[PDB]
Amino acid sequence: ANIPRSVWDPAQHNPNWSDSYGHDITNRRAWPARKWTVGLEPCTPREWLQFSHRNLAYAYNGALRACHSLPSMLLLYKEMKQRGVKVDVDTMNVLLTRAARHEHIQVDDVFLLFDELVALGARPDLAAAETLHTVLSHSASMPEEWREARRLQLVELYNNLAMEEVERLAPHRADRLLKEQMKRF
């Protein structure tokens, strides 16, 4: 009764008792911080203080701009979406301009990409609205019903942008600037 039965009886063996040499090796490992090319994984509290998902968006915007080809931009966008970092106006505009420039891409794919970006959270802006308007104007081969359906979305988006602009310019009493923006709208 002195030595407990649980330490020498094989019937009471612990099924999931790891050995002494395994867990220490498991926790000793320091995996590489370059899980993704653009950013570095933080290993120290200082690196964690510097690290932020929103800040990674700036570096991804820079790398996307440095990329010269739409397939490379798409690969970088896939990496960014897999990382889950924030997607904003800068990446939306730089992606849409190259998608519009590219000819091999169907004009529906760029609209789908814009819709999924605005679903991810990147708020629309006037430059992206202009790019989508250009694609809609250069989408002759597509059905007229499709063009009209996307025209409704474009016009409501422009109305939303105008409302946001007037809301953000009302307090500062910049009547001339507000009129100038609304002339473009």
Partner: peptide, 20 residues
């Protein structure tokens, strides 16, 4: 719930990991 627990652990002098 180890399989063949009686023969492997409580029946074998090697606990199934010793090649006699």
């Amino acid at each position: 719930q180890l399989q063949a627990q009686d023969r492997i652990i409580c029946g074998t002098h090697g606990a199934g990991i010793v090649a006699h």
